[PDB]
Design a protein around this nucleic acid. Structure first.
Ligand SMILES: [K+]
Length: 122
DNA sequence: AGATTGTGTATTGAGA
DNA sequence: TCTCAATACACAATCT
């Protein structure tokens, strides 16, 4: 059967950039997946909408990109879940922090910062 | 026990 | 035309 697929009018930043920004601006520079999902939802009204598949995309990003590093909730449970996630900025591909040229940014360029690197790198 | 997490697999389509 | 971030679903294993 044909696979379902749709592109959504998501914010014009990569999921990587948005995740990295919420982690880096958290008090301990670490967040669980549950906490990341909550904080991402604060960034833009799109994430308060009824499309929820971005939550899966965020999970995907944490595993897929090497810049996201799991920190064990319990050091004696290396197979435990609900761990913290950190960002290693030296592993981030810099261009993935730039504002994306999508229909969403073209609709109103001036409400979107051109680069999130200033809010990620110290 | 279903919800959640972490990762594997795979397809998609707009920017470049 | 082509890349890869976006998106979708499987599945094992933990979590509550
Ligand atoms: K990772």
């Amino acid at each position: 059967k044909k696979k379902n697929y749709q592109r959504y009018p998501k914010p014009p930043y990569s999921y990587l950039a948005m995740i990295a920004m919420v982690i880096q601006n958290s008090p301990e520079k670490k967040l669980t997946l549950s906490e990341i999902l909550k904080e991402i939802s604060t960034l833009f009204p799109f994430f308060k909408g009824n499309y929820k598949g971005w939550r899966d995309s965020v999970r995907h990003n944490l595993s897929s990109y090497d810049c996201f590093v799991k920190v064990l909730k319990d050091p004696g449970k290396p197979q435990g879940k609900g761990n913290f996630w950190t960002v290693e900025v030296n592993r981030i591909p810099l261009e993935l922090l730039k504002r994306q040229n999508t229909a969403v940014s073209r609709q109103d360029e001036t409400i979107f910062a051109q680069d999130l690197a200033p809010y990620i790198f110290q």
